[PDB]
Amino acid sequence: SRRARIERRTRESDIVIELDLDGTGQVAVDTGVPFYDHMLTALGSHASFDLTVRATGDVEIEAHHTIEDTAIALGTALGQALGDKRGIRRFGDAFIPMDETLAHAAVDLSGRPYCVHTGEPDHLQHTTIAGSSVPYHTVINRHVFESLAANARIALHVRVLYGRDPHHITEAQYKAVARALRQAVEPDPR
Template identity: 65%
Template sequence: MSEQTRPSRTGRVERVTKESSVLVEVDLDGTGTVDISTGVGFYDHMLAQLGKHGLLDLTVKTEGDVHIDAHHTVEDTAIALGEALRQALGDKAGIRRFGDALVPLDETLVQVAVDLAGRPYCVHTGEPEGQAYVVIGGDYVGSLTRHAVESIASNAAIALHVRVLAGRDPHHIVEAQFKALGRALRDAVAWDPRVVGVPSTKGSL
């Protein structure tokens, strides 16, 4: 597929429930420009890593019931992000489809692999014991990372494997996961000039 015939790959999702109001806009062919506000500062930082290292132009505006806790805000934002990614991917013609990344952050090492197969599946392993109960940045509980990546995978309809291979610092363990996810997505959504049509023997993804 030539550059002249490539479609615009953007997604826009608004999701409103009694627990949150979410707007997500994504451009797969961006430069990593982000504008993010969820009311959960550490989560804002993580989504910024995803956009920056995935070269996704990403706008996220969430108002959630953070007076209760961050769970609904994090999960609902991830659901909308997954839906926006799925929308932006379109028919997936001409892309690589598979992507992976091995990302270090000081003592932490994370591996992420993704398949834009149209079939949702998530494997999330390797976090050290106790990571799920650590509070980071005042209101982000470590267990929310799994909820976020599972929600993205399910709603984007992608197969996603996230493996924490090493790590001690709770902040680094989460951040490396979002950076690696960004890098893997960047690889998977990239145009491949040698790919004719959809990269599947089925003819669709």
């Protein structure tokens, strides 16, 4: 019903997005950045979407360009899948507790592209989440949410109430956005 397929070819990266809003959590994400894949899987699963992401980018330089472009394309796909935004709840928020972390996101679908991101500890501006592959810098979370809000043309407010672990803080923010989106896109029985 509300589906979107977006292909975005640039110099930096080549992205393909497939999104269905009325899904069941069938998610398959591959971007070359493992932690970003983990986060997008959470975003897709907790929002009850159907999400397929195939991204190829210059991960030798760093993940910034791929992550940015993927977020832009995902935002575009979401905005297109919303369509006219007729007969939906249009307002959603969610608190996500993750151990010692509490995050909150509030969305307004009909509202104009705006993004406020507050509350993250100052040490998250130089934190890196690294494994066996391309690392993820937590200074990019604001960039990701801003890109998604700007390209979906929605109002997104993400707050971290408190939290210590950077993994938990990031994951909670993504889940909060996912659940706010899920609530906002539901049909309104009024």
